[PDB]
Each structure stands twice: as structure tokens, then as C-alpha cells.
Amino acid sequence: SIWKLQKAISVLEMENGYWWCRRKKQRAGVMLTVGTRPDGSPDERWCFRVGEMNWATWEQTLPRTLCEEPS
Amino acid sequence: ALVVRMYDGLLQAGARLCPNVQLEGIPNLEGLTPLKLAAKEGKIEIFKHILQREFSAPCQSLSRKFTEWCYGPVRVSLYDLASVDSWEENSVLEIIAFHSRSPHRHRMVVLEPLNKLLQAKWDRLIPRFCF
Amino acid sequence: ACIQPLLEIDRDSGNPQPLVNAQCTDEYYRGHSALHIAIEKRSLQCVKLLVENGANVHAKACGHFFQKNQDTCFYFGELPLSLAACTKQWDVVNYLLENPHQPASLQAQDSLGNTVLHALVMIADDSAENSALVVRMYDGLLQAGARLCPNVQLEGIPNLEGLTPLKLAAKEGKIEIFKHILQREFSAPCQSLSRKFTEWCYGPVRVSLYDLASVDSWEENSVLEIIAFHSRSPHRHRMVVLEPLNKLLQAKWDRLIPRFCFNFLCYLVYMLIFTAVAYHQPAGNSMLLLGHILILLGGVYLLLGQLWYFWRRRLSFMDSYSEILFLLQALLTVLSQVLCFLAIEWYLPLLVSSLAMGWTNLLYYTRGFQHTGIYSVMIEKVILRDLLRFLLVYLVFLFGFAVALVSLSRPPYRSILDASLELFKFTIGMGELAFQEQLRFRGVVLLLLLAYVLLTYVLLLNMLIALMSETVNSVATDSWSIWKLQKAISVLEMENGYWWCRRKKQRAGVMLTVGTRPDGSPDERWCFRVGEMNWATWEQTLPRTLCEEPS
Amino acid sequence: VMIEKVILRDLLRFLLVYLVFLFGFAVALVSLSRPPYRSILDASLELFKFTIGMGELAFQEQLRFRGVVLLLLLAYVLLTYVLLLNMLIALMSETVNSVATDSW
Ligand SMILES: C=C(C)[C@]12C[C@@H](C)[C@@]34O[C@](Cc5ccccc5)(O[C@@H]1[C@@H]3C=C(COC(=O)Cc1ccc(O)c(OC)c1)C[C@]1(O)C(=O)C(C)=C[C@@H]41)O2
Numbered sequence: 001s002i003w004k005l006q007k008a009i010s011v012l013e014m015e016n017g018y019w020w021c022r023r024k025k026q027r028a029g030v031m032l033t034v035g036t037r038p039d040g041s042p043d044e045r046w047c048f049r050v051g052e053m054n055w056a057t058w059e060q061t062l063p064r065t066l067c068e069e070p071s
Numbered sequence: 072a073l074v075v076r077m078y079d080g081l082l083q084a085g086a087r088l089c090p091n092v093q094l095e096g097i098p099n100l101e102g103l104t105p106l107k108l109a110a111k112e113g114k115i116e117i118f119k120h121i122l123q124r125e126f127s128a129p130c131q132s133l134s135r136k137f138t139e140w141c142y143g144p145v146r147v148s149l150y151d152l153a154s155v156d157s158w159e160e161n162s163v164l165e166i167i168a169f170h171s172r173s174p175h176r177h178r179m180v181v182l183e184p185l186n187k188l189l190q191a192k193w194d195r196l197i198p199r200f201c202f
Numbered sequence: 203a204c205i206q207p208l209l210e211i212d213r214d215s216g217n218p219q220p221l222v223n224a225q226c227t228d229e230y231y232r233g234h235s236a237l238h239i240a241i242e243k244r245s246l247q248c249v250k251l252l253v254e255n256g257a258n259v260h261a262k263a264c265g266h267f268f269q270k271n272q273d274t275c276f277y278f279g280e281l282p283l284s285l286a287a288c289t290k291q292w293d294v295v296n297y298l299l300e301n302p303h304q305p306a307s308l309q310a311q312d313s314l315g316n317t318v319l320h321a322l323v324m325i326a327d328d329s330a331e332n333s334a335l336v337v338r339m340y341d342g343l344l345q346a347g348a349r350l351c352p353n354v355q356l357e358g359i360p361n362l363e364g365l366t367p368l369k370l371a372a373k374e375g376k377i378e379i380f381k382h383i384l385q386r387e388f389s390a391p392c393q394s395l396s397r398k399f400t401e402w403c404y405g406p407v408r409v410s411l412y413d414l415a416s417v418d419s420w421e422e423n424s425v426l427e428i429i430a431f432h433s434r435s436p437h438r439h440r441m442v443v444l445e446p447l448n449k450l451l452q453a454k455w456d457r458l459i460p461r462f463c464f465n466f467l468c469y470l471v472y473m474l475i476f477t478a479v480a481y482h483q484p485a486g487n488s489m490l491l492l493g494h495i496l497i498l499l500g501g502v503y504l505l506l507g508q509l510w511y512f513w514r515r516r517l518s519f520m521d522s523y524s525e526i527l528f529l530l531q532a533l534l535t536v537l538s539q540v541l542c543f544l545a546i547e548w549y550l551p552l553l554v555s556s557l558a559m560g561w562t563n564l565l566y567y568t569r570g571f572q573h574t575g576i577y578s579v580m581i582e583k584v585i586l587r588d589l590l591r592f593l594l595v596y597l598v599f600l601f602g603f604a605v606a607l608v609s610l611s612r613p614p615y616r617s618i619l620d621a622s623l624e625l626f627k628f629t630i631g632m633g634e635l636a637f638q639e640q641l642r643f644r645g646v647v648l649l650l651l652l653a654y655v656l657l658t659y660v661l662l663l664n665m666l667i668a669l670m671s672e673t674v675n676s677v678a679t680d681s682w683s684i685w686k687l688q689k690a691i692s693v694l695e696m697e698n699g700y701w702w703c704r705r706k707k708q709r710a711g712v713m714l715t716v717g718t719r720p721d722g723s724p725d726e727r728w729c730f731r732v733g734e735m736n737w738a739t740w741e742q743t744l745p746r747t748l749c750e751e752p753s
Numbered sequence: 754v755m756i757e758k759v760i761l762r763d764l765l766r767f768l769l770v771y772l773v774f775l776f777g778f779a780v781a782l783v784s785l786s787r788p789p790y791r792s793i794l795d796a797s798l799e800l801f802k803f804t805i806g807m808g809e810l811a812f813q814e815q816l817r818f819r820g821v822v823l824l825l826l827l828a829y830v831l832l833t834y835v836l837l838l839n840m841l842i843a844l845m846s847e848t849v850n851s852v853a854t855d856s857w
Contacts, residue, residue, distance in 0.1 A: 001177035004189070008180060009168050011193050012157060014200065027158045028192070034149070035131050038090050043132055046156070047149040050187050051274030055144055055332050058244075058290055062141055063125075066149070070140040070231075070267075143242055143289055145276045480784045551821040554785045558825060561777030562832075565770065574766050580839050589835075623823065630830065631806040666838070673842050678850055 034066060075120045086130045102161075106154055110163045113173025122184050123150070150184040205248070209255045223258050232265035233280070241286050241294060249294060259283070259304050264313045270324070279312045279321035287318050287343065288325050290335050299346060308347045308356055315362035318343065323371045326379050333378045340379065341386075348392045352720060364423065368416055372425050375435025384446055385412070393746075394719055399729075400745045402752045406737050409752075411716070411729040412446035418728070419694060420709045430691050431515045439683040442690060449732045450710060451686070455693050459570075462696060466567045472500050473560055476535075480557050483550075498539050505532035510701045520586050524566055531559045569692065575685045587672055588665050595661060600625060603654050610647060612640055629658060716748070754856055759844065767840055771833070775800055778829050785825075787816055804833060 017023040027046070035043040085094050096104055103111065109118045126134040137149040157164050164185070167176055180189070212221040226234040237257045240248045253259075263280045270277045278288040283306045286294040298306045311317055316324070319340065326336040347356045357366055365373065371380045387398045397413040419426045426447075429438055442451075479493040508529040516522070538552035565581070568574040604622040607615055614635065615621040627633055628651070636651075637644050699705030711728045718724045779796045790796045802808040803826065810826065812819040 001181060004180050005177045007193055008164070008189050010200070011189065011196055012164065012168050014196055015157065015192065025158055028156055028188070029152045034137055037132050046152050047137070048152050048184060048188060049139065050148050050150065050183065052146050052148060053144055054146065055329065055335075057141075057144060057146075063138060065138050065140050067140055070142055070147070143276060145274060147274065477780055481780060483784060550785065550817040554781045554817075555821065555825070557784065558777055558781045558828075561773060564773060568770075574770075577766055577770075577839070577843070580843060581835070584835055584839060584842075626827075627810065630803075632808070632810070669838065669842055670845065673846055674849055678846075 074117055078117070078120075079124075079126075082133055083126075083130055086133060104154060107161075107163055107166055110166050110179070111171055111173075113171065113175050113179075115175065115178060118179060119182055122155075122182060152184075152188075155184060155188070206251060206255070220256070222252060222255055223261075225261070226265075228265075230266050231263075233261070233263050234265060234267075235261035235263065235282075237261055237282050238263055238285055241282060241291070242289065244291070246291075246294060246297070249297065253297070253301050253303060256303070259298060259306055260310065262313055277321070277324055279314070279316050279318065279324075281310060281312060281318065283308075283310075284312070284318045284321050287322055287339060290339065292339075292342070295343070296346070299350060308343070308351070309354060309359060311359070315360075317356075317359055319356065319367045320361060320365075320370060323367050323376055323379060324374070326376055328378075336379055337382050340382075341388075344395060345388075345392060348395060366416065369423070369425060369428055372441060373428050373433055375433065375437050375441070377437060377440055380441065381444055384417075384444055387745075390746075392720075394717060394725055399716060399748060401731070401748050402750060403739065403744060403747065404752050406735055406739055408734055408736065408739070410732050410734060411714075411748075412732065413716070413727050414446070414450070414711050414730050415727070417446065417450070418710050419697060420707060426690065426694055427515075430687075430694060432517065439680065439687050442687045443683050446730055446732065448686075450730055451690055451693065454697065454710065455689060458693065458696055462567075462570060462692070465696075466570075469564075469567075473564070476500075476557065476560065480553055483553075494539070494543075497535065501532055501536040501539060504528065505536050507701050508532060520582055523582060523585070527559070527563050528566075531556060531563055534559065569685070569688055572682075572685060575688075576681050579681050579684050579688070583672075584669070588668050592661065592665050596658075599654065599657060599661070603650060606650060607647065610641070610650075611638065614638060625654070629655075714748075762847065763840055763844070767836070771836060774829070774832065774836075778825065781825065782822070785817055785822060800829065803830060 015025060029046045029048045031044070031046045033042045033044050034047070037043045082094065085092065095106065098104055099108065101108075106118070106121050109121060121135075123136050124134055125136045135151045137151075139147040139149050141147075155163050167179060180186070209222060222236055224236075226232065235258070237249070237252055237259070238261065240252055259282055261280075261282060266272060267275050268277065268280060269275060278285050283295065283298050286298060308318060312321070322336060322340060322343075326332060344356065357368065360366055361370060363370075368380075368383055371383060383397075385398050386396055387393075388396045399411040401409040401411055403409075415421075417425050429441055433441075442448075475493065476497055479490075479497055482490070508525055511525055512529060534552060535556040538549050538556055541552065542549040565578060568578045600622060604618060604625050607621050607625065608618060611621070615624065615638075624633065633651075636647065638647070697705075697707060699707070709728065711730045713726065713728045715724050716727045716729065775797060779793060779800055782790055782800065783793055783796050786796075790799070799808050808826075810823075813822055
């Protein structure tokens with residue numbers, strides 16, 4: 001964990017930029033419409049994907065998705 | 072357990088009363104939304120609850136964890152990055168790394184939306200570190 | 203509801219290519235099909251409907267989502283039956299086998315060559331429920347294949363690399379199913395699939411048999427050579443301690459101790475003659491030229507032998523750690539005697555270094571005894587863990603303080619390595635002659651010495667706590683398994699024989715008649731015996747024996 | 754009791770391996786010595802003085818070579834450090850998986 005923390009501080013400091021060049025950073029993640037908000041417009045948010053594997057899915061239940069087709 | 076129960080139910084009642092208000096966005100006098108305050112004070116389990124939070128059909132929009140698609144044993148889960156990404160000034164990662172004072176700052180980084188995110192940024196920016 | 207009228211519109215239109223038999227076209231889901239969706243959506247009824255309309259039960263999903271090593275991809279093979287097998291839907295498999303239209307065949311292979319059993323091995327990784335599901339599905343599919351086709355034996359069908367599911371099951375490091383395959387007994391309706399029997403059980407003592415059809419090293423490409431020279435998983439040392447392997451390796455190791463001791467003694471004679479040649483280097487020229495010829499032939503012999511070994515079985519450090527040293531040592535000795543016959547005036551340090559390296563390389567043969575065998579495994583674990591990184595950090599410290607002392611020194615401390623020797627001789631306690639008096643400031647060198655001593659103390663203490671941390675959190679039943687694996691490596695090497703002498707190696711185990719085949723002739727197998735003592739025999743019923751009188 | 758357990762567990766392996774190291778390096782040094790390194794006993798005495806810390810080292814400088822001698826002595830000291838660490842970690846592994854009833 002301490003190794004992950006020091007790597008985090010390092011990658012954030014390198015993402016900030018050096019002293020003679022303050023750089024306009026980049027957003028990360030996918031922006032899409034997730035759902036519909038109760039006041040008019042649909043819900044439009046930025047997202048991050050995590051792909052995960054589990055084997056207890058059959059006896060448990062499947063929830064509702066955002067896109068039916070995997071893409 | 073009582074805190075996550077009261078928090079979720081109180082957010083549902085706030086959804087039912089006034090829809091125009093966004094309750095998790097209101098800052099304190101320090102300028103802090105409550106997720107950021109939960110990160111700054113070093114409170115663990117409630118922070119883990121807020122980062123991965125799902126709700127039922129009458130209030131979908133409150134929820135943060137979305138499934139893009141599930142196909143058998145493999146699943147693709149979406150996490151929101153509305154306050155996590157360091158693109159905006161004063162992000163939760165920036166609070167953990169710099170502005171905090173808690174002695175458990177290493178414990179909160181192995182969580183689900185931070186782990187693969189820092190993995191992706193570090194593997195994106197190896198070559199300038201080598202340079 | 204709309205599907206059967208939609209397929210009815212597809213049929214009534216008179217289409218040459220039907221709708222249900224249609225493939226996705228992209229790279230990512232190449233060759234995906236409707237039936238795979240019907241299976242993955244847990245629907246028996248839609249599978250029944252699609253089978254009634256004429257769906258292809260061999261729709262080969264050969265896409266980029268279906269390869270093994272791409273990120274977030276699900277490998278199951280490409281067959282629909284494979285998918286229904288992997289996703290633990292039993293009745294779907296039974297319907298796909300026993301439908302009246304377009305029946306499934308278990309002998310079918312994917313584009314990668316795997317059948318249903320191979321992919322079913324591929325998807326098992328680790329749990330209680332995963333392994334129980336995989337083993338139960340495996341046995342049920344074997345029984346259904348037995349009743350469906352009595353023609354072929356299903357476990358004989360090889361992969362594109364040439365693997366049956368036992369061999370690939372060991373190659374990928376899947377352990378629990380592999381243990382299940384090596385000791386597998388079935389019931390009376392189909393007992394001819396089993397591999398374990400009981401010869402006789404005289405109360406609490408019993409003699410189990412095991413089949414060795416692909417486990418003995420007599421046959422080409424056995425499980426032994428796959429565990430030793432092909433398996434890359436870090437759990438191989440758990441895959442050696444199994445039940446019908448241990449008896450076989452003990453029998454072969456006690457069968458061929460004497461060739462090991464003989465070759466050890468010959469190597470000791472080689473090093474003693476090399477010791478005499480190196481000491482009496484300096485009539486006696488007859489003995490010296492005999493030493494030339496003897497060490498030349500020995501170095502040629504071992505150099506060619508280890509070159510042949512390096513060519514034969516290699517496809518990555520600590521496992522092959524032993525042979526590299528003998529190859530380099532033999533190359534050093536042959537090069538030294540080559541330059542000596544050339545008289546190139548470089549042969550004396552090569553000779554002394556070869557003598558040193560050869561006497562240090564004698565610890566290969568400490569694996570015969572367990573008391574030094576565990577010691578040699580600990581030496582290798584020291585060599586893997588901390589030594590390289592610690593030496594790199596030490597070179598950083600050494601070079602930094604040595605260049606500091608050189609640049610501080612304006613007749614001691616003349617050059618870089620000529621001061622680096624002073625810096626290293628200072629760490630053991632032979633450092634001397636401070637206050638060099640060639641410049642005003644010497645407290646500089648005083649503080650440099652203090653800093654170097656304290657930081658080297660810190661680095662040795664860090665190496666100590668790293669060794670303790672790595673050694674304390676590991677099971678005591680690990681080094682013994684590593685020793686058994688290393689003995690297995692050595693005994694298979696000696697069973698290979700010499701390189702100048704191709705041996706006619708022999709089969710192991712007793713051939714007997716284990717039973718009858720369901721087609722005619724009696725089943726005769728080669729088998730390995732194993733005795734066992736079980737004082738819980740009176741709880742259960744007695745198993746089916748071959749010969750009642752204990753032989 | 755721990756004296757007897759340590760001598761019984763360490764000597765008959767460790768001194769044998771260490772003796773192979775000392776004998777090989779001593780014959781190597783006598784060979785590479787073409788008044789220092791006079792006899793085999795004195796050479797083994799010098800090589801054990803480097804285990805006590807009294808060995809006097811210098812460049813040969815009119816001989817076969819000097820840095821070969823230096824690198825061999827480096828290899829000797831570092832490998833004996835390796836073996837002492839090995840004896841320590843083996844004794845700690847035997848000490849870790851033990852019970853408080855046994856020595857009593
Ligand atoms: C492959 C490795 C790791 C190695 C190759 C050579 C260069 C080696 O330096 C090392 C690096 C080193 C140097 C000095 C001290 C420690 C380590 O150690 C061995 C290697 C270190 C020694 C001792 O070898 C061992 O580690 C014990 C050993 C040898 C052979 C085995 O089959 C074995 O397994 C049981 C164990 C042998 C040397 O060849 C030697 O005596 C001289 C002349 C150089 C030694 O590199």
C-alpha cells in the first residue's frame with residue numbers, strides 16, 4: 001500500500017508539470033449518457049470502466065444494464 | 072451500518088421532497104463537498120460506501136455504480152469520476168496526496184475506483200519518468 | 203413472442219441465406235451468433251425454439267473477444283456446447299446432445315483445436331465452488347460421451363500443440379482438477395473409464411493400483427517432462443507431491459542412485475587431476491603432457507555435453523541455474539588450455555579462475571542428501587531474492603564515495619579503482635592511514651568515512667530484515683517439495699543417459715489385465731502399485747477387487 | 754541444550770562446504786603466486802585471517818596479474834557472507850516453528 005501511495009504522489013506530481021511549464025491537463029474517462037434525470041434532460045456523466053470476473057452469478061441475480069449490447 | 076443506513080435513507084427522503092436540490096454538492100465553509108470531507112478526515116468505511124453506491128428504480132440518478140454490460144462470469148462496471156479525477160482543481164486524490172493529515176492514507180488507495188485509475192495513469196506516464 | 207413469426211417471415215420470404223444462421227461481422231465479435239446469446243441469457247425455451255427452426259449448433263465464435271490473452275475477454279472455446287458446458291447449465295447440454303435435429307458431437311474441435319474438455323480445463327482457476335462445478339461437469343460429460351459414442355476414447359484427442367487434457371491440465375498449472383484426474387474411480391455401469399483400482403484390501407491394509415498411460419517417461423512427451431521442462435506456472439512444486447507420482451519417483455530414484463554416485467566420483471577424480479595440474483604447473487614433462495591431454499579431453503567432454511543439453515531442452519533463471527555454471531566453467535577451461543597450447547600468456551588467470559569455479563560448482567551434488575539439499579535450496583533462494591539489487595545499490599554507494607575521495611585527494615588514492623580498493627578494504631577493518639595531510643581539510647574524509655560506515659550498516663540490516671521477512675511467511679512444507687522436484691529433474695536427466703551413449707530406456711510398472719472393455723477384448727494396462735493403511739475402512743463398504751488372494 | 758542442537762544441526766554441513774571453498778581458493782592462490790603465499794598452510798592461514806580481519810592485501814604487479822587476485826578475494830568474502838547469512842536464516846527457520854514445551 002505504501003508503494004502504491006508513493007507511486008500516486010509521483011504520478012500526480014508528474015501530471016502537474018514542471019516549474020517553467022504549467023500544462024493544461026487532460027480529462028480521463030469516457031463521457032456518455034447514463035440515464036434520464038427526473039428534471040427534463042437525461043443524465044450525462046463521465047465514467048471509468050472496470051472489468052471484473054465472478055462465478056457466483058448464476059445462483060445470484062442479474063441487474064439492469066445501460067447498454068444491452070456489449071461494446 | 073447505522074451510518075450507511077441513515078445516509079442512504081436520508082438521501083432518498085431528500086430526493087422525494089425537493090428534486091431541484093443537489094444535496095451532495097453543497098460545500099462547507101472550507102469549501103468541501105461531503106465526499107471530500109470524508110476523504111480528508113480519514114474516515115474509511117463510509118467513504119468506501121459512497122464510492123460504490125447503487126440504488127433501486129425510483130431513484131436511479133442518486134446511484135454512482137453502473138453496469139455497462141454483464142455477460143456470464145465477466146462484467147463491466149462503470150464508476151463515476153465527478154469528483155475523483157485530478158483534472159478539476161481540488162480533487163479527492165489531491166486531498167489524499169497533499170492536503171490530508173490522516174495516518175491511514177495508504178488504506179484508502181486500494182479501493183475499487185482508485186486502483187485501476189492510478190494503474191492507468193502510471194502505465195500511461197512511465198516513459199517520461201524513464202526520460 | 204415475435205421470434206417464431208419473425209423466423210416465419212424469414213422462411214416465407216424464400217431466403218437463400220437464413221436469418222438465424224447469420225454471423226456478426228466486426229473484428230471484436232467475429233463469428234458471434236444468436237444461439238450463443240440464447241445460451242448466455244439462461245433460456246432453455248429459446249434454445250429449444252431456435253433448435254426447432256434450424257440453428258447451427260457449430261457456430262464457431264472465432265472473434266477477438268474470444269481469445270485468451272486479450273484484456274476483459276472470456277475464453278470458453280468457440281462451440282455452443284462448450285459455452286453451455288462452461289456456464290454450468292446442465293439441461294441445455296443434455297438437450298444439445300439429445301435433440302432430434304442436428305446433434306452435437308463431442309469430438310468437434312475449435313479453431314484453436316480445443317474440445318469441450320480442454321476449454322473446461324481452461325476455465326477452471328480456483329475456488330471450492332468453481333472446482334466442484336468443473337469436476338462434476340467433467341465427469342458427467344465423460345459418462346454422457348460414453349453412452350453417446352462407444353467408438354472413440356474422448357481423452358485421447360490431442361490439441362494443436364499435441365496435448366490431451368491431462369497434459370494441458372498439468373501444463374497450465376491447474377492443480378485440483380489434475381489431482382482429480384490422476385485418482386478417478388467410477389461405478390459399475392462404466393468402470394472402464396477409471397484409472398484407480400483396488401487389488402486387495404486385507405482389513406486396514408490395501409493395495410491401490412494406478413494407470414500410467416501418459417505419466418511414465420517411457421512414452422514420448424510425458425507429464426513428467428511437461429512439469430519439469432515446459433511448465434511455467436509458479437505452483438509446479440505442488441504438482442509433484444501427488445499420489446501416483448511419489449511412488450514412481452521413489453522407485454526410480456532408488457533404482458538409479460549408483461549411476462549418480464559413479465558420475466559424482468568420476469567428477470571428483472577429474473577435479474583432483476585438475477588440482478594436481480594446477481599445482482605442479484611450474485622427465486616430469488610426460489606427466490605434464492598427460493595432464494594436458496586429460497584435462498583437454500575432460501573439458502571437451504563436459505563442454506560438448508552441456509552444449510548439447512542447452513540445445514536439447516530449453517524453450518527462466520533459477521530453474522536452469524545449475525547448468526549455466528558448468529557450461530561457462532567448461533568453456534573457461536577449454537579456452538584456457540586452447541590459449542595454453544597457443545601460448546598466449548593469458549592462461550594463468552583463466553586456469554586459476556577455472557579451478558576456483560570448478561571447486562565452487564561441486565555443490566551440485568549436495569542434492570542427494572536432504573540435510574544439505576535443503577541447504578542448497580536455501581542458497582538458491584538467497585541468490586534469487588536480495589543479492590542482485592543489493593549489489594547494485596552497493597556499487598552506487600561505492601562509486602560515489604570513491605569518486606568523492608579521489609577528487610578530495612588533490613600519493614595514496616591515486617586512481618578510481620585504486621581508491622575503491624581502499625574503500626572496500628575499509629569496510630572489513632583493514633583501513634588505515636587517515637589524516638593524509640596533503641590538504642587542509644581532512645574532517646571531510648572523516649565525515650565521509652562515518653557516512654559510508656553507517657549507511658552500509660543500514661544496507662546490511664535491510665538485507666537481513668528482507669531475508670527474515672521472505673523466510674518467515676512461507677510454509678515449512680515448501681522446501682521439501684522443491685527438493686522432490688529437483689530430484690525429479692535430476693533423475694529424468696540421468697534416465698535420459700549420456701550424450702555419447704543413447705540408452706535403451708525401460709518401461710516402469712507392471713502390465714496386468716485390469717478389466718474388460720465394453721467392446722470385446724479385456725482391458726490390459728500398465729500400472730503402478732501403492733500400499734496404504736486406513737483405519738477408517740470399517741465405516742464404508744469394501745470396494746471391488748481384482749484378485750482376492752493377496753499376492 | 755541449544756548449544757547441542759546448534760552444533761548437531763550446523764557443523765557437519767557448513768564446515769564441509771566452507772572447507773571446499775577454503776581449499777579451492779587456497780590452491781588457486783598458491784597456483785597464482787607463481788615470500789607471500791609461501792606454503793599451503795600459510796595460504797590457508799592468510800585466507801582465514803581475511804575471515805578474522807587480519808589479511809594483508811596488495812597488488813602483485815609483477816606476476817600473472819593483480820585484479821584477478823583482487824576479484825577472487827572479493828568473491829571469497831562475499832560468498833562467506835552469503836553462507837553465514839544462510840546458517841543464520843536456517844537457525845531462525847528452525848527456531849520459528851517450535852514449541853515452548855520441547856526444550857523443557
Ligand atoms: C550466476 C551467478 C549468480 C554467479 C556466476 C559466477 C560469476 C559466480 O558470481 C555470481 C555473483 C556473486 C559474486 C560474488 C559473491 C556472490 C555472488 O555468483 C554466482 C557465482 C558465485 C560462486 C558460488 O556459486 C554459488 O552460488 C553456489 C552454487 C554453485 C553451483 C550450483 O549448482 C549451486 O546450486 C546448488 C550453487 C561461483 C563462481 O563461479 C565463482 O566461484 C567465481 C570464479 C565467480 C562465481 O554470479
